Amino acid sequence: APSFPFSRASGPEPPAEFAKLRATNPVSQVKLFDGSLAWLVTKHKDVCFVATSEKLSKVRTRQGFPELSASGKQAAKAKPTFVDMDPPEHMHQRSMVEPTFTPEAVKNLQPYIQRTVDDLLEQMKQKGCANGPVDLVKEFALPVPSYIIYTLLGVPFNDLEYLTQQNAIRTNGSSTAREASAANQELLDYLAILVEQRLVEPKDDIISKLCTEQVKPGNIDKSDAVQIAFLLLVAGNATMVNMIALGVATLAQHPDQLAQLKANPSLAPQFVEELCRYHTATALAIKRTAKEDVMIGDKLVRANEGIIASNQSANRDEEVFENPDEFNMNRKWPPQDPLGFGFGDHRCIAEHLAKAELTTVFSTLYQKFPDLKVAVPLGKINYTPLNRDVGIVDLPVIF
């Protein structure tokens, strides 16, 4: 049994193991950091099964749960939020914050998302790059998702820049364990204050709705509100930043597609669709433990055994996506859903928001800066460590 998680084949590539497993051993056993074994599922059909099977559980206090790191094991001892719950607890809590993320709500949010992207690009423009390249991540990829989610949660304008910086430190590879920890705790402290304030005088934001609708009636605790708001903040922010950066790098690697996007920004949606399939930046979130024996493919997963369903592998499944390792914005999509945002009940709550943010970015970035260009050779791009989810640390650009 090979150690898991696997390391990416290279900066922008997925681990090489998946393709081989998909073809010769679709459902196999892998060894986790602590020596325990878990079932790794690599085929699209099987990943979808694992994502929806009612015989599987997300509760981390169940023995056999596939925790992939030492810290993951510690985090499992805390009170869980809906991300780690099974029905009926799962939807009872998720329903408390879903309103802001429905397709209709996100469609009505389009002007705000556009306004936010326009303002950040303009700030980038007025500043220029006369003295050299600027980091596309720091100046644009980071603040876009950050400002939007913070604002949606209820954070006031003047506090955005500081909080955006602190949340980054949380996951920055350069941060020491202490720095990452301090910033993490500091965001929780700030959220605790916001809850207290909104409990007194609510505003038109997420935290206020939790206070008024759930905390006040005693449905949930104040700390619960803080944790739910915290989950919404840290669940996909770093991912959104990485996706924007990977999107720019990808367009640079395939000039003809960039030329097409520039000529027709209406292709932004399909470009985003392919980007979320090709670059599965959150590939270790579909995990479970079997509550009872369950058959998957030619294997039997016994009760109390853990399962890791790779949506990244599923998104490169030849049986579902023709020429899967080819980035093609004009891809002819099959009836099967690409799984960049998961599947089933637990499917990313912000899928519509995330796509709207990415679609807005790629339907605007090159109109603002038609000559935007990565300021370093593409083969020198600073990607996230190979033993981590795919992403980009920084991206020097000129325009």
Under a CB-based contact definition with an 8 Å cutoff, are residues 131 and 390 in contact?
Answer: no
Q: What does the block give as tokens for 79?
A: 């009170």
Rounded to whole angstroms, how far apart are CA atoms 294 and 108? 42
Which CB sits closer to ligand HEM, 6 or 343?
343
Instruction: Give the shortest CB-220-to-ligand HEM separation in angstroms.
Output: 16
Taken as a whole, the chain contains a residue count of 399
Closest CA to 349 of 13, 125, 3, 102: 102
Contacting range for ligand HEM; rule: CB under 6 A; set: 201-209, 262-270, 320-328, 339-347: 339-347
Contacting range for ligand HEM; rule: CB under 6 A; set: 24-32, 105-113, 207-215, 239-247: 239-247
Contacting range for ligand HEM; rule: CB under 6 A; set: 182-190, 217-225, 282-290, 362-370: 282-290
Give yes or no for residue 346 binding ligand HEM (CB under 6 A): yes
Give yes or no for residue 209 binding ligand HEM (CB under 6 A): no
Give yes or no for residue 68 binding ligand HEM (CB under 6 A): no
Q: Per the annotation, does 276 bind a ligand?
A: no
Give yes or no for residue 353 binding ligand HEM (CB under 6 A): yes
Residue 38: partners with Cβ closer than 8 Å, 6 or more residues away: 4, 29, 30, 32, 64, 66, 305, 306, 307, 308
Give yes or no for residue 286 binding ligand HEM (CB under 6 A): yes
DSSP readout, 104-172?
HHHHHHHHHHHHHHHHHHHHHHHH--TTS-EEHIIIIITHHHHHHHHHHHT--GGGHHHHHHHHHHHH-
Give yes or no for residue 388 binding ligand HEM (CB under 6 A): no
Instruction: Give the shortest CB-308-to-ligand HEM separation in angstroms.
Output: 12
Q: According to CB under 6 A, which one of 8, 43, 60, 94 is a site residue for ligand HEM?
A: 94
Compute the CA torsion angle 119, 124, 126, 127 (nearest 10 deg): 140
Give yes or no for residue 231 binding ligand HEM (CB under 6 A): yes
The CA R_g of the chain, rounded to the nearest whole Å, is 21
Give yes or no for residue 243 binding ligand HEM (CB under 6 A): yes
Annotated binding site for heme: 348
| Residues engaged in binding ligand HEM (CB under 6 A) | 51, 82-83, 94, 145, 149, 231-232, 235-236, 239-240, 243, 281-282, 285-286, 311, 340-344, 346-350, 353-354
